[PDB]
Amino acid sequence: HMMGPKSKVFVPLYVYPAPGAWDPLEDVISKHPDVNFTVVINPGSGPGPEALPDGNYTREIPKLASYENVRLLGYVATTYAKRNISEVRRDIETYAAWPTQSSNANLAVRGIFFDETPQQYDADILAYLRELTDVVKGTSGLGPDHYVVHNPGAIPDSRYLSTADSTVVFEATYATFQERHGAELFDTIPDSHRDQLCAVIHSVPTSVEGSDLRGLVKQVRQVADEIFITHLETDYYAGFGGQWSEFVDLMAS
Ligand SMILES: CC(=O)N[C@@H]1[C@@H](O)[C@@H](O)[C@@H](CO)O[C@H]1O
Ligand SMILES: [Cl-]
Q: Are strands 111-115 and 166-173 parallel, antiparallel or unpaired?
A: unpaired
Atom nearest to 77 CA in ligand 1? 9
Q: Which residues pair with 72 in a beta bridge?
A: 39
Contacts of 4 (CB under 8 A, 6+ apart): 218, 221, 222
Contact 159, 192 (CB under 8 A): no
- Starting from the CA of residue 237, give the closest ligand: 1
> How buried is residue 151: exposed, middle or buried, by Cβ count under 10 Å (0-12/13-18/19+)?
buried
Contacts of 110 (CB under 8 A, 6+ apart): 71, 72, 73, 142, 143, 144, 145, 146, 147
With a Cβ cut-off of 6 Å, ligand 1 is lined by: 12, 75, 115-116, 151, 153, 171, 200, 237
Experimental method: X-ray
- Alpha-carbon gap, residue 192 to 95, rounded angstroms: 30
DSSP secondary structure code for residue 147 in this structure? E
Whose CA is closest to atom 2 on ligand 1? 12
Whose CA is closest to atom 5 on ligand 1? 115
Helix (H) or strand (E) holding 193: none
Helix (H) or strand (E) holding 179: helix 174-179
Indicate the angle between helix axes 23-31 and 244-252, nearest 10 degrees. Answer: 20
- Alpha-carbon gap, residue 168 to 78, rounded angstroms: 14
Contact 130, 163 (CB under 8 A): yes
**Cα dihedral 248, 149, 187, 82 sign:** positive
> How buried is residue 187: exposed, middle or buried, by Cβ count under 10 Å (0-12/13-18/19+)?
exposed
Atom nearest to 115 CA in ligand 1? 15
Contacts of 200 (CB under 8 A, 6+ apart): 10, 12, 168, 170, 171, 172, 227, 228
AA letter at 16: Y
Q: How far is CA 241 from the centre of its chain?
A: 16
**CA 15 to ligand 1 center in whole angstroms:** 12
- Alpha-carbon gap, residue 60 to 17, rounded angstroms: 7
**CA 23 to ligand 2 center in whole angstroms:** 19
The answer to whether the annotation marks 157 as part of a ligand binding site is: no
List the one residue out of 229, 222, 234, 233 whose CA is nearest residue 246.
Answer: 229
The answer to whether the annotation marks 236 as part of a ligand binding site is: no
**CA 99 to ligand 1 center in whole angstroms:** 25
- Alpha-carbon gap, residue 243 to 152, rounded angstroms: 26
List the one residue out of 38, 131, 142 whose CA is nearest residue 92.
Answer: 142
